[PDB]
Amino acid sequence: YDDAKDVARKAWEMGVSDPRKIVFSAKIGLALTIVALLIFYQEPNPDLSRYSVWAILTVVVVFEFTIGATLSKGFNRALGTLSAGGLALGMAELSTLFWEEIFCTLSIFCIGFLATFMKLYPSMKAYEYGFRVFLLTYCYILISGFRTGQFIEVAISRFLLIALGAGVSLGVNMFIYPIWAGEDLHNLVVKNFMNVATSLEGCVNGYLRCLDPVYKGYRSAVESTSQEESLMSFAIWEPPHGPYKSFNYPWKNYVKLSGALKHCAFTVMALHGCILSEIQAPEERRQVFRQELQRVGVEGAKLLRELGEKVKKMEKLGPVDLLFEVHLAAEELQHKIDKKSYLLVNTYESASALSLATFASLLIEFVARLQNVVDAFKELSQKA
Amino acid sequence: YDDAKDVARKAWEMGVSDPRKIVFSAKIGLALTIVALLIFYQEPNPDLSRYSVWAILTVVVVFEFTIGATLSKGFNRALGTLSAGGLALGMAELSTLFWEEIFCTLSIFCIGFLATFMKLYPSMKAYEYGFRVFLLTYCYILISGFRTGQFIEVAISRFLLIALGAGVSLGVNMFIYPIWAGEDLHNLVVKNFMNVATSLEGCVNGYLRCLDPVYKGYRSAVESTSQEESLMSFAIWEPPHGPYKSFNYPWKNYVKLSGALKHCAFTVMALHGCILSEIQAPEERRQVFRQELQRVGVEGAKLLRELGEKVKKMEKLGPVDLLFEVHLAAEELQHKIDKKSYLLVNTYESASALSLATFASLLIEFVARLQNVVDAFKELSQKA
Missing domain, CATH: 1.20.58 (Methane Monooxygenase Hydroxylase; Chain G, domain 1)
Known part of the structure; x- marks a missing residue:
C-alpha cells in the first residue's frame, strides 16, 4: 500500500510539476471519444461502418506530443502509405493480368526484402516508422486487391476514412491547447x-x-x-x-x-x-x-x-x-x-x-x- | 549517378562487413511470403479470408532482429492485447446491458486518458509499444463488439489468426539462422x-x-x-x-x-x-x-x-x-x-x-x- 502511494504520487508529482502530460492525455482521450461519438451517433447506418475502426485507430496511431512531431510523422507515414498505394495498385492491375498467385507471392517477397534494409540502414534509424507503414501497407493493399475485383473505390473510401480520422487528430492537436516543438x-x-x-x-x-x-x-x-x-x-x-x-x-x-x-x-x-x-x-x-x-x-x-x-x-x-x-x-x-x-x-x-x-x-x-x-x-x- | 554509387556501396559495405542484415531481411521476406502463400494457395475459400490480412500484418508487426527482442516484445504486446480483451469483453457485455452509446463513449475516453499517462511516464519509456497496442486494442474490440452481437466467436477466430501469424513469425525467427541478443x-x-x-x-x-x-x-x-x-x-x-x-x-x-x-x-x-x-x-x-x-x-x-x-x-x-x-x-x-x-x-x-x-x-x-x-x-x- 505504501509503494502504491508513490505510484499515485509519481503521477501527481510529474503532473503538478509539468501540466503538459495531463493536457496531452486529455487531448488524445478527447480525439478518441469524438471519433467514437461520431461513429455511433452520426454514422449508425451499417450500410458502411466497418471501416469505422479506421477512423478511431488512426487517431490513436497518429497523435504525438508536439505539433512538429505529429505533423512530420503524419507526412512520412502518408508518403509511405501513398507510395505503397500507387506502386501496389500498379502491381495490382498487373497482378490480375495473366500464374498470378505466384507472381503476387514474389511481389511481396521482393517488397519485404528491399524495404527491410532501408529500414535497417544506420542512417535511416528514425525513419523506421515510415518503412514499417510502407512494408505493412503494400502487404494490406496487395492482399485485399488480389481478393477484390475493383479495389480503387474501396481504397478511396479507406483514404477518406483515414482522412476523417487524421483530420480530427491534427485539428484537436493543433487548435485545443497546442504543444509546440520549437x-x-x-x-x-x-x-x-x-x-x-x-x-x-x-x-x-x-x-x-x-x-x-x-x-x-x-x-x-x-x-x-x-x-x-x-x-x-x-x-x-x-x-x-x-x-x-x-x-x-x-x-x-x-x-x-x-x-x-x-x-x-x-x-x-x-x-x-x-x-x-x-x-x-x-x-x-x-x-x-x-x-x-x-x-x-x-x-x-x-x-x-x-x-x-x-x-x-x-x-x-x-x-x-x-x-x-x-x-x-x-x-x-x-x-x-x-x-x-x-x-x-x-x-x-x-x-x-x-x-x-x-x-x-x-x-x-x-x-x-x-x-x-x-x-x-x-x-x-x-x-x- | 556518383552519389547513387555510394548508396549501393553503403548497402554493400554494411552488407559484406555484417552479414546479419541481409539474413534478417531474408527472414522477414520469407515469413511474409510464406504467410501470403499459405493464404492464397491453402486458404483460397472466401467462406473466411478477410481476416487474412491478420495473418500477414502480424508477421510484419512482430518480427524483430534478436530472438530476445521478438520474444519479449511479443509477450508484452500479447499481455496488452489480452488484457484489453478481457477488460473490453467485460465492458462489452456490460455495454450491451441497459444509454449504452454514451456509456460506450465514456468507456473509451476513460481508457484513452488512463493509458496515455502510463505511456508518458518517465519510467515506462520503452514499454510504450505495449501501451499503444493496449489503447489501440481496447478501441478495436469495443467498437467491433458494440457493432456485433456475439463477438466472442469472432474474437476467437482473430486470436487463432494472430496465432497463425505470430506462430510462423517466431518459428522462422528462431529456427532459420537465429540472431540472439546474448x-x-x-x-x-x-x-x-x-x-x-x-x-x-x-x-x-x-x-x-x-x-x-x-x-x-x-x-x-x-x-x-x-x-x-x-x-x-x-x-x-x-x-x-x-x-x-x-x-x-x-x-x-x-x-x-x-x-x-x-x-x-x-x-x-x-x-x-x-x-x-x-x-x-x-x-x-x-x-x-x-x-x-x-x-x-x-x-x-x-x-x-x-x-x-x-x-x-x-x-x-x-x-x-x-x-x-x-x-x-x-x-x-x-x-x-x-x-x-x-x-x-x-x-x-x-x-x-x-x-x-x-x-x-x-x-x-x-x-x-x-x-x-x-x-x-x-x-x-x-x-x-
Whole structure:
C-alpha cells in the first residue's frame, strides 16, 4: 500500500510539476471519444461502418506530443502509405493480368526484402516508422486487391476514412491547447545553463567540503545533443507560432549554442572526475587554495547562470563584456599558484600532491572554454 | 549517378562487413511470403479470408532482429492485447446491458486518458509499444463488439489468426539462422576494449605528433550503457543457447565489466580534452617527456587490448597479474617528472606550462582507474 502511494504520487508529482502530460492525455482521450461519438451517433447506418475502426485507430496511431512531431510523422507515414498505394495498385492491375498467385507471392517477397534494409540502414534509424507503414501497407493493399475485383473505390473510401480520422487528430492537436516543438527546444537550450552552473558549483564546492546531484547536472546537457538534433527536425514543421517571428527561424544555433555549451561541459566532466578519482589531493593542502578555487566557481557560475537568462528571455539587447570577473578570477588564480607551487612538486607521495595541480588547471581551462560560448551565442543573439 | 554509387556501396559495405542484415531481411521476406502463400494457395475459400490480412500484418508487426527482442516484445504486446480483451469483453457485455452509446463513449475516453499517462511516464519509456497496442486494442474490440452481437466467436477466430501469424513469425525467427541478443552483448562488451585501447593510444600519440578517429573511439564505449542495459532486458529471454551453459546466466556483469570500463574511459575523455583545450603545453616542452608519456600509452593499451581477448574468448583460465608493467610505467613516469619539474611551475606564460601537469596526472589516474576493472572482471571470470 505504501509503494502504491508513490505510484499515485509519481503521477501527481510529474503532473503538478509539468501540466503538459495531463493536457496531452486529455487531448488524445478527447480525439478518441469524438471519433467514437461520431461513429455511433452520426454514422449508425451499417450500410458502411466497418471501416469505422479506421477512423478511431488512426487517431490513436497518429497523435504525438508536439505539433512538429505529429505533423512530420503524419507526412512520412502518408508518403509511405501513398507510395505503397500507387506502386501496389500498379502491381495490382498487373497482378490480375495473366500464374498470378505466384507472381503476387514474389511481389511481396521482393517488397519485404528491399524495404527491410532501408529500414535497417544506420542512417535511416528514425525513419523506421515510415518503412514499417510502407512494408505493412503494400502487404494490406496487395492482399485485399488480389481478393477484390475493383479495389480503387474501396481504397478511396479507406483514404477518406483515414482522412476523417487524421483530420480530427491534427485539428484537436493543433487548435485545443497546442504543444509546440520549437519552445520545447528553447526551454531546453536554457535548461542546460541551469544544470551546468550547479555542476560547476557542485564540483568546485564538493572538492573542498570536508574537515549524485552533480552527476545528474552535467550529464543532462551532454546527453541532449542527440535530442536537440531531433527537436531541430520537428521544429521546422511549425508555423511562426508567436515570438518566433518569421519562417526559417534559426533552429540551428540552438543546437550550436547548446553545442558550444556541451563542449564547455567537457571540463566539468573531468572537473568532477578529479573528486571521484582514486588519487586526490589531501584535505590540508586543498584548503590553502580555498579562496581562489572558490572564487572561480562562484563567479564562473554567475555568468553561466545569466547566459541562460539571456536565452530564456532571448534578450535582443546584448551580452556586453560578460567575462571580466572570471578572467580576473582565473588570472589571479594562476598568480596564486605562482607563490605556493612547492605544494605541487618536489611514486604516490607526489602523485597525490600533484592532483591538486590537476584541478587548478582543469578549472582555468574551463575559463578558456567559456570564451567560445559567448561568441557562439553572440551570433545567435543578433541574427535570430 | 556518383552519389547513387555510394548508396549501393553503403548497402554493400554494411552488407559484406555484417552479414546479419541481409539474413534478417531474408527472414522477414520469407515469413511474409510464406504467410501470403499459405493464404492464397491453402486458404483460397472466401467462406473466411478477410481476416487474412491478420495473418500477414502480424508477421510484419512482430518480427524483430534478436530472438530476445521478438520474444519479449511479443509477450508484452500479447499481455496488452489480452488484457484489453478481457477488460473490453467485460465492458462489452456490460455495454450491451441497459444509454449504452454514451456509456460506450465514456468507456473509451476513460481508457484513452488512463493509458496515455502510463505511456508518458518517465519510467515506462520503452514499454510504450505495449501501451499503444493496449489503447489501440481496447478501441478495436469495443467498437467491433458494440457493432456485433456475439463477438466472442469472432474474437476467437482473430486470436487463432494472430496465432497463425505470430506462430510462423517466431518459428522462422528462431529456427532459420537465429540472431540472439546474448551474443549481441558479449560481442559488445568486448568491442569497447578495442575502441578504448586505440582511444588511449590515439590521445597519447596525438598529444605529441608535431614538430576524428579518437572521438569515435571512446564515445562508443560511453554511449553503450544505455544500450547494454537494454540488451540485458532482451538477454534474459533466450534459452541456454550454446556456450552460455545454464539458465540465469550473469548478464549483469557484462553491464558491470562494461561499467568499470566506461568508468575507466572517463579519463580518456579528459585525456583527449587536453589536446582539444584552448591551452596546451608547447611542442618543445612536450618532447622532453616523450618516452615515459609514450611508455604508459604503449603498455597501457596492450593490457586493455588483451582484457577484451579475455572476454571474447571468455577464458576460464585467468587474468593473472596483468598490471605490473603499467604500474612500473606509471611509477617511473612520476619519478621522471620529479627531476624535470621546473618545466611545470615557476597569467598565460604559466598556464600553458602547466598543462603538462595536467596530462601526466590525468594519465597516472587512468592507471589507477585500471585496477578497478580487473577486479570488476575477476568476479565475472570466475562465477560466469
